[PDB]
Amino acid sequence: DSFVIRGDEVRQIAPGQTGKIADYNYKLPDDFTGCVIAWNSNNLDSKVG
Amino acid sequence: SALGKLQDVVNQNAQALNTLVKQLSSNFGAISSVLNDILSRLDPPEAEV
């Protein structure tokens, strides 16, 4: 699953965590057996203005 | 004090049952002895723990 989140909201997408992104955008099952892999895309995914 | 054996057996059984009922109301290190309040106060992971 790929999606572009804010830096402050990377912790939300963990198993058994709550927040706006967790409950309204992408919910992780509490029994999630996987890897949350995130990296910066400031050059690629930020545009002037 | 002639029917001591039967009375003692009855008292032991009643005491064991009462002890079990009282022990139902023991925290065992948890926040509360009632599960509904624990579910209400805590998020699903901590409440589950």
PDB file of C-alpha atoms in Angstrom:
ATOM      1  CA  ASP A   1       0.000   0.000   0.000  1.00  0.00           C
ATOM      2  CA  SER A   2       1.410   3.379  -0.973  1.00  0.00           C
ATOM      3  CA  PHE A   3       0.273   6.803   0.225  1.00  0.00           C
ATOM      4  CA  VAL A   4       1.932  10.154   0.952  1.00  0.00           C
ATOM      5  CA  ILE A   5       1.480  11.249   4.576  1.00  0.00           C
ATOM      6  CA  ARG A   6       2.872  14.139   6.688  1.00  0.00           C
ATOM      7  CA  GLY A   7       5.979  13.561   8.762  1.00  0.00           C
ATOM      8  CA  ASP A   8       4.089  14.123  12.021  1.00  0.00           C
ATOM      9  CA  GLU A   9       1.543  11.414  11.100  1.00  0.00           C
ATOM     10  CA  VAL A  10       3.872   8.480  10.373  1.00  0.00           C
ATOM     11  CA  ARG A  11       3.410   7.160  13.923  1.00  0.00           C
ATOM     12  CA  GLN A  12      -0.421   7.045  13.483  1.00  0.00           C
ATOM     13  CA  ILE A  13      -0.167   4.311  10.856  1.00  0.00           C
ATOM     14  CA  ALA A  14       1.013   1.675  13.349  1.00  0.00           C
ATOM     15  CA  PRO A  15      -1.078  -1.254  14.651  1.00  0.00           C
ATOM     16  CA  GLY A  16      -3.387  -0.219  17.489  1.00  0.00           C
ATOM     17  CA  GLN A  17      -2.825   3.534  17.141  1.00  0.00           C
ATOM     18  CA  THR A  18      -5.455   6.273  16.867  1.00  0.00           C
ATOM     19  CA  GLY A  19      -5.586   9.619  15.112  1.00  0.00           C
ATOM     20  CA  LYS A  20      -7.287  11.381  12.223  1.00  0.00           C
ATOM     21  CA  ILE A  21      -5.310   9.456   9.583  1.00  0.00           C
ATOM     22  CA  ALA A  22      -5.781   6.184  11.474  1.00  0.00           C
ATOM     23  CA  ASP A  23      -9.566   6.377  11.792  1.00  0.00           C
ATOM     24  CA  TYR A  24     -10.539   8.339   8.668  1.00  0.00           C
ATOM     25  CA  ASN A  25      -7.910   7.592   6.014  1.00  0.00           C
ATOM     26  CA  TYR A  26      -5.956   4.347   6.572  1.00  0.00           C
ATOM     27  CA  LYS A  27      -6.586   1.934   9.450  1.00  0.00           C
ATOM     28  CA  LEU A  28      -4.017  -0.727  10.327  1.00  0.00           C
ATOM     29  CA  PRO A  29      -5.333  -3.984  11.825  1.00  0.00           C
ATOM     30  CA  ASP A  30      -4.219  -4.455  15.435  1.00  0.00           C
ATOM     31  CA  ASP A  31      -2.683  -7.817  14.406  1.00  0.00           C
ATOM     32  CA  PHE A  32      -0.661  -6.272  11.540  1.00  0.00           C
ATOM     33  CA  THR A  33       2.246  -8.533  10.647  1.00  0.00           C
ATOM     34  CA  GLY A  34       4.170  -6.341   8.247  1.00  0.00           C
ATOM     35  CA  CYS A  35       6.607  -3.483   7.614  1.00  0.00           C
ATOM     36  CA  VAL A  36       5.765   0.231   7.686  1.00  0.00           C
ATOM     37  CA  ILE A  37       8.469   1.596   5.361  1.00  0.00           C
ATOM     38  CA  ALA A  38       8.603   5.386   4.984  1.00  0.00           C
ATOM     39  CA  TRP A  39      11.092   7.802   3.405  1.00  0.00           C
ATOM     40  CA  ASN A  40      11.328  11.492   2.645  1.00  0.00           C
ATOM     41  CA  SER A  41      10.016  12.794  -0.664  1.00  0.00           C
ATOM     42  CA  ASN A  42      10.479  16.535  -0.034  1.00  0.00           C
ATOM     43  CA  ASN A  43      12.216  17.134  -3.362  1.00  0.00           C
ATOM     44  CA  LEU A  44       9.890  14.819  -5.311  1.00  0.00           C
ATOM     45  CA  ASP A  45       6.532  15.493  -3.627  1.00  0.00           C
ATOM     46  CA  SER A  46       6.756  19.210  -2.733  1.00  0.00           C
ATOM     47  CA  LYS A  47       6.119  21.811  -5.434  1.00  0.00           C
ATOM     48  CA  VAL A  48       6.792  25.569  -5.305  1.00  0.00           C
ATOM     49  CA  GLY A  49       3.739  27.416  -4.035  1.00  0.00           C
TER      50      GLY A  49
ATOM     51  CA  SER B   1     -20.893 -30.116  68.890  1.00  0.00           C
ATOM     52  CA  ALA B   2     -21.974 -33.636  67.894  1.00  0.00           C
ATOM     53  CA  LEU B   3     -22.506 -33.065  64.147  1.00  0.00           C
ATOM     54  CA  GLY B   4     -19.100 -31.433  63.732  1.00  0.00           C
ATOM     55  CA  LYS B   5     -17.970 -33.404  60.676  1.00  0.00           C
ATOM     56  CA  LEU B   6     -20.955 -32.684  58.408  1.00  0.00           C
ATOM     57  CA  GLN B   7     -21.140 -29.058  59.558  1.00  0.00           C
ATOM     58  CA  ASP B   8     -17.406 -28.683  58.904  1.00  0.00           C
ATOM     59  CA  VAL B   9     -17.784 -30.144  55.388  1.00  0.00           C
ATOM     60  CA  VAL B  10     -20.696 -27.787  54.619  1.00  0.00           C
ATOM     61  CA  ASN B  11     -18.774 -24.813  56.042  1.00  0.00           C
ATOM     62  CA  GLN B  12     -15.690 -25.694  53.977  1.00  0.00           C
ATOM     63  CA  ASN B  13     -17.705 -25.912  50.746  1.00  0.00           C
ATOM     64  CA  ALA B  14     -19.529 -22.644  51.491  1.00  0.00           C
ATOM     65  CA  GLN B  15     -16.253 -20.934  52.415  1.00  0.00           C
ATOM     66  CA  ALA B  16     -14.622 -22.103  49.171  1.00  0.00           C
ATOM     67  CA  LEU B  17     -17.558 -20.799  47.113  1.00  0.00           C
ATOM     68  CA  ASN B  18     -17.551 -17.466  48.980  1.00  0.00           C
ATOM     69  CA  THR B  19     -13.773 -17.170  48.564  1.00  0.00           C
ATOM     70  CA  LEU B  20     -14.130 -17.761  44.817  1.00  0.00           C
ATOM     71  CA  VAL B  21     -16.878 -15.099  44.585  1.00  0.00           C
ATOM     72  CA  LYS B  22     -14.744 -12.600  46.531  1.00  0.00           C
ATOM     73  CA  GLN B  23     -11.720 -13.431  44.380  1.00  0.00           C
ATOM     74  CA  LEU B  24     -13.831 -12.580  41.303  1.00  0.00           C
ATOM     75  CA  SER B  25     -13.689  -9.005  42.663  1.00  0.00           C
ATOM     76  CA  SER B  26      -9.867  -8.867  42.846  1.00  0.00           C
ATOM     77  CA  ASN B  27      -7.829  -6.504  40.691  1.00  0.00           C
ATOM     78  CA  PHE B  28      -4.863  -8.890  40.056  1.00  0.00           C
ATOM     79  CA  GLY B  29      -2.839  -5.779  39.245  1.00  0.00           C
ATOM     80  CA  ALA B  30      -5.389  -4.400  36.772  1.00  0.00           C
ATOM     81  CA  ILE B  31      -6.834  -0.881  36.749  1.00  0.00           C
ATOM     82  CA  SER B  32     -10.290  -2.005  37.898  1.00  0.00           C
ATOM     83  CA  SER B  33     -12.162  -5.156  38.853  1.00  0.00           C
ATOM     84  CA  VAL B  34     -14.994  -4.537  36.344  1.00  0.00           C
ATOM     85  CA  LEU B  35     -14.394  -5.034  32.626  1.00  0.00           C
ATOM     86  CA  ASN B  36     -17.012  -2.579  31.308  1.00  0.00           C
ATOM     87  CA  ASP B  37     -15.290   0.366  32.999  1.00  0.00           C
ATOM     88  CA  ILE B  38     -11.896  -0.844  31.701  1.00  0.00           C
ATOM     89  CA  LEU B  39     -13.282  -1.010  28.147  1.00  0.00           C
ATOM     90  CA  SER B  40     -14.817   2.459  28.513  1.00  0.00           C
ATOM     91  CA  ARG B  41     -11.708   4.153  29.933  1.00  0.00           C
ATOM     92  CA  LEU B  42      -8.960   2.536  27.828  1.00  0.00           C
ATOM     93  CA  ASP B  43      -8.117   2.175  24.162  1.00  0.00           C
ATOM     94  CA  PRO B  44      -8.449  -1.409  22.706  1.00  0.00           C
ATOM     95  CA  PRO B  45      -4.707  -2.427  23.090  1.00  0.00           C
ATOM     96  CA  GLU B  46      -4.239  -1.365  26.729  1.00  0.00           C
ATOM     97  CA  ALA B  47      -7.754  -2.525  27.663  1.00  0.00           C
ATOM     98  CA  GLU B  48      -6.980  -5.897  26.065  1.00  0.00           C
ATOM     99  CA  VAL B  49      -3.716  -6.145  28.053  1.00  0.00           C
TER     100      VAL B  49
END
